[PDB]
Amino acid sequence: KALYDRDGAAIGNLQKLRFFPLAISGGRGARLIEENGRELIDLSGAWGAASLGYGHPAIVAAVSAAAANPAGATILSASNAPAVTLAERLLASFPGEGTHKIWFGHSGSDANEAAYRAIVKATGRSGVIAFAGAYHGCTVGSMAFSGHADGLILLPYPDPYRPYRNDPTGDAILTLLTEKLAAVPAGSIGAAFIEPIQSDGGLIVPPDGFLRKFADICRAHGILVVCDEVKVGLARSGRLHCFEHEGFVPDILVLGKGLGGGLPLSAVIAPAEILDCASAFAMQTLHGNPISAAAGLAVLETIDRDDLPAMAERKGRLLRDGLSELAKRHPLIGDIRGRGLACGMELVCDRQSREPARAETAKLIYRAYQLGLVVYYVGMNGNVLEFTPPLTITETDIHKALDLLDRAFSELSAVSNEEIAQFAGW
Amino acid sequence: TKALYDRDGAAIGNLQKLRFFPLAISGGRGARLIEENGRELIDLSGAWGAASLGYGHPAIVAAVSAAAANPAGATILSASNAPAVTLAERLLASFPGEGTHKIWFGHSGSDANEAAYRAIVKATGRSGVIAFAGAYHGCTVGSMAFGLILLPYPDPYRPYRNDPTGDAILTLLTEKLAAVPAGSIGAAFIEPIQSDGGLIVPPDGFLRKFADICRAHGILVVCDEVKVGLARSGRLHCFEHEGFVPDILVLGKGLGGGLPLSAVIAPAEILDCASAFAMQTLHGNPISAAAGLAVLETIDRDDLPAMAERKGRLLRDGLSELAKRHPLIGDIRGRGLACGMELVCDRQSREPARAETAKLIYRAYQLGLVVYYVGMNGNVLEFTPPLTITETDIHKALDLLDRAFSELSAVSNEEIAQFAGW
Numbered sequence: 001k002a003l004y005d006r007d008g009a010a011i012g013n014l015q016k017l018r019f020f021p022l023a024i025s026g027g028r029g030a031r032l033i034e035e036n037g038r039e040l041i042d043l044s045g046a047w048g049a050a051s052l053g054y055g056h057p058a059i060v061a062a063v064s065a066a067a068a069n070p071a072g073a074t075i076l077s078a079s080n081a082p083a084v085t086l087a088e089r090l091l092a093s094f095p096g097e098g099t100h101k102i103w104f105g106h107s108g109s110d111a112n113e114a115a116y117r118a119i120v121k122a123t124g125r126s127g128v129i130a131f132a133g134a135y136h137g138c139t140v141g142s143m144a145f146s147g148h149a150d151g152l153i154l155l156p157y158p159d160p161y162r163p164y165r166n167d168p169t170g171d172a173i174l175t176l177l178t179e180k181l182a183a184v185p186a187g188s189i190g191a192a193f194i195e196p197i198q199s200d201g202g203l204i205v206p207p208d209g210f211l212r213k214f215a216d217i218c219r220a221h222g223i224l225v226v227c228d229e230v231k232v233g234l235a236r237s238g239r240l241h242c243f244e245h246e247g248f249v250p251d252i253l254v255l256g257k258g259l260g261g262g263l264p265l266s267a268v269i270a271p272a273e274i275l276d277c278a279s280a281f282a283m284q285t286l287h288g289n290p291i292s293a294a295a296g297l298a299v300l301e302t303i304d305r306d307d308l309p310a311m312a313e314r315k316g317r318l319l320r321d322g323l324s325e326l327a328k329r330h331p332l333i334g335d336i337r338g339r340g341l342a343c344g345m346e347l348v349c350d351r352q353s354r355e356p357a358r359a360e361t362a363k364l365i366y367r368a369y370q371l372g373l374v375v376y377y378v379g380m381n382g383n384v385l386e387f388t389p390p391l392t393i394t395e396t397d398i399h400k401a402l403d404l405l406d407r408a409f410s411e412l413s414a415v416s417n418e419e420i421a422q423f424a425g426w
Numbered sequence: 427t428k429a430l431y432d433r434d435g436a437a438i439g440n441l442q443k444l445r446f447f448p449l450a451i452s453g454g455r456g457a458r459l460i461e462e463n464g465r466e467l468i469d470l471s472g473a474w475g476a477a478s479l480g481y482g483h484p485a486i487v488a489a490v491s492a493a494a495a496n497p498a499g500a501t502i503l504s505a506s507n508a509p510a511v512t513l514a515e516r517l518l519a520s521f522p523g524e525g526t527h528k529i530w531f532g533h534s535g536s537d538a539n540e541a542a543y544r545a546i547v548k549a550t551g552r553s554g555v556i557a558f559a560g561a562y563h564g565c566t567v568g569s570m571a572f573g574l575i576l577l578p579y580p581d582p583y584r585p586y587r588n589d590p591t592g593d594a595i596l597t598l599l600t601e602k603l604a605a606v607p608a609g610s611i612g613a614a615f616i617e618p619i620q621s622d623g624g625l626i627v628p629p630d631g632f633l634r635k636f637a638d639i640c641r642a643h644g645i646l647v648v649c650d651e652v653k654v655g656l657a658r659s660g661r662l663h664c665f666e667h668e669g670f671v672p673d674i675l676v677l678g679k680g681l682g683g684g685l686p687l688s689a690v691i692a693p694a695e696i697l698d699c700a701s702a703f704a705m706q707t708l709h710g711n712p713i714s715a716a717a718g719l720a721v722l723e724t725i726d727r728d729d730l731p732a733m734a735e736r737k738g739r740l741l742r743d744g745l746s747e748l749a750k751r752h753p754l755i756g757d758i759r760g761r762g763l764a765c766g767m768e769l770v771c772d773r774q775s776r777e778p779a780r781a782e783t784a785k786l787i788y789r790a791y792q793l794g795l796v797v798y799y800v801g802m803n804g805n806v807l808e809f810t811p812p813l814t815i816t817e818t819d820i821h822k823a824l825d826l827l828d829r830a831f832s833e834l835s836a837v838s839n840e841e842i843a844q845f846a847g848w
């Protein structure tokens with residue numbers, strides 16, 4: 001009878017990543033509306049896909065006009081204007097050069113896979129560098145180089161809070177890179193996949209200067225540098241593109257989630273020679289469909305019009321300030337990290353040992369949900385709270401979210417172990 | 427203010443291009459695409475079958491606008507949402523079905539087929555697969571994976587081992603199964619009309635028989651209806667023409683009526699075997715879901731399978747008259763508004779007329795008609811228009827098609843060469 005019960009009866013568990021019985025019938029701004037009418041503040045923004053929140057007027061206007069008069073449904077066998085305009089608008093925002101082209105997909109998973117397959121096709125080099133704990137996607141293609149393909153080389157992420165080999169600079173990781181590359185035929189690696197802030201590892205910001213150095217090693221060895229900005233892309237970091245923080249430019253940019261503002265849309269920006277090496281090669285019927293592309297353009301126009309990078313920078317300091325405020329009261333909070341409106345809070349059993357508090361995290365978000373706050377956890381040990389709110393979230397929503405979060409830290413023990421065991425999580 | 431098609435060449439890479447002619451679209455209304463210059467073309471492609479309701483259908487506009495205005499979140503991964511749930515129930519209500527099956531939502535047929543295969547392997551441990559030569563299950567690593575028993579599709583127009591019944595294919599199947607351990611094959615993937623093969627309807631009874639053999643061996647029958655499902659065949663589900671019910675149904679293309687939306691209908695045990703297993707962030711998103719609902723609602727409301735059956739016969743009847751005037755036409759085939767026309771150099775030899783097929787669609791494009799070719803040989807014109815296409819739209823496209831056949835020589839080899847196509 002209830003919506004959550006019906007979901008359990010109609011929809012298989014295969015795609016479920018449930019942390020609590022959240023059941024939604026509506027949305028407005030940064031709020032989700034449960035079946036009964038209860039309002040929750042969404043600090044997850046659907047893992048960041050709701051870039052402009054819910055029922056944003058520019059999304060509404062864009063998608064309504066597109067549905068009323070659609071330019072076909074595909075970029076495969078026809079050129080259509082909404083996609084071409086979006087392709088140029090994405091091209092404009094990327095420097096460079098360039099000589100760069102767009103590939104459109106439905107998701108970050110299909111875009112990382114396309115990027116990979118295009119590289120191997122264009123160059124003949126199938127080897128891949130990727131980072132341990134990396135999330136590039138859940139398709140057979142994009143999982144092949146995600147964290148736990150042949151010629152896959154996995155490196156530790158430069159994690160300040162848990163430095164590899166207890167070297168805080170990351171120099172040991174670059175040294176490992178170097179040892180790994182010479183154990184392998186010269187010119188055999190075609191690509192290096194990089195998250196500028198590592199999402200699934202625990203929203204990890206790498207040590208300053210590391211990515212630039214890593215890219216320089218890559219460029220010196222013929223290896224194309226692929227920046228996977230699905231989670232942290234497009235203004236979320238407080239800059240239009242997250243690599244703008246790291247003093248390097250990737251050869252390839254992968255975009256997703258927030259790009260569609262609520263509709264399935266991803267994109268690969270890659271040199272022309274990579275995307276033109278084949279035709280009819282990586283394709284799905286509704287790729288570059290006009291409704292998705294229209295929304296994508298409404299996201300970009302709104303980013304520019306509202307200076308959303310500047311907003312995300314502002315609202316992110318406000319959010320991190322408040323979280324530090326909570327640390328001063330709650331011993332579980334070991335680490336606050338992030339850029340713009342991509343923030344992570346690591347919870348630990350002891351601030352010195354920095355041992356992961358998995359059970360408390362699960363109870364926390366469950367309680368948070370009961371109080372009216374949607375937040376999910378992420379990370380290797382399930383101990384990292386992830387904050388990726390709509391970029392249009394108001395300061396008033398953030399204050400309210402902080403009060404509810406404070407309340408959820410205090411009221412955590414209320415959650416029984418059997419309530420938590422109802423929900424498999426990751 | 428360059429040409430739209432030229433702007434396309436400069437911004438968008440070749441990787442996903444399946445281009446046969448310089449079609450550049452700025453609008454759509456019903457079964458008509460509107461090019462940049464304001465010429466309306468009758469769409470016989472319906473975007474490879476995705477535009478099931480055509481362009482600007484009121485039901486899609488109303489549902490999409492309302493969904494955009496008040497979205498129940500953006501995902502089904504981490505929240506339950508009402509539109510996704512309502513649509514899941516509706517799809518299960520359309521299948522038999524009750525309490526045995528569940529729904530998994532995707533973006534596309536490729537991911538839906540990939541999810542079905544991964545779920546089966548995970549649930550049953552049986553990784554072995556049966557599939558048909560020339561099959562199209564999608565264009566991702568996961569969906570092009572299909573260890574493998576490959577069979578010829580039973581094509582009445584091109585029999586296997588000199589057996590038009592198709593019974594030699596059932597015999598080969600029996601041999602391959604006997605040759606490999608019992609319980610090593612988990613799944614059989616079938617198109618009930620083979621799309622990439624060139625819209626081939628198999629001989630009567632073959633698939634029913636094929637399904638028996640599979641169940642006899644503990645093998646799940648997966649019916650891939652991404653192209654040909656949802657009212658398109660003259661029934662809601664194409665397997666209803668075939669006298670069997672599959673264990674798993676894959677749906678896509680027309681399902682979103684223009685948005686990306688796919689679905690797997692599978693036994694609960696297959697879909698409940700693991701969690702956080704096969705998932706992408708925008709899966710089950712409410713804007714696609716609402717669009718799926720509008721499609722299912724319109725199918726029932728404007729009796730679209732019956733309309734497809736009517737308009738299909740009228741289309742194929744018209745093409746048989748073209749065959750009386752144009753010797754190129756060798757076989758007209760299909761169910762409902764999913765039709766194929768195989769073009770041959772001799773009707774007895776059945777030798778494929780590839781070169782002439784390319785010119786035909788290029789020519790037809792110039793005339794105001796959107797239509798494409800498929801098949802291993804590049805000689806089968808696919809007809810998959812909006813289920814909404816009008817009786818007037820059909821007659822009008824038949825005249826243009828007639829005119830296209832008469833004017834093939836007007837299109838040169840150098841014009842054909844400018845477009846890479848397949």
Ligand SMILES: *Cc1c(COP(=O)(O)O)cnc(C)c1O
Pocket residue numbers: 106107108109110112135136137138195199228229230231256257705706707708
């Ligand atoms: C979410 C994500 C993906 C995959 O996108 P989907 O839409 O879930 O397929 C890939 N890479 C990163 C870094 C992501 O965050």
Ligand SMILES: *Cc1c(COP(=O)(O)O)cnc(C)c1O
Pocket residue numbers: 283284285286533534535536537539562563564565617621650651652653654678679
């Ligand atoms: C189109 C199609 C697919 C794949 O759908 P995409 O959206 O192109 O990935 C799979 N099977 C059949 C029969 C199809 O027609």
Ligand SMILES: O=C1CCCCCN1
Pocket residue numbers: 076283284285444474562621
């Ligand atoms: O059937 C088709 C044509 C091939 C490209 C993918 C869309 N679907």
Ligand SMILES: O=C1CCCCCN1
Pocket residue numbers: 017047135199200503705706707
């Ligand atoms: O980072 C995430 C969580 C895993 C499910 C896909 C959405 N993105």
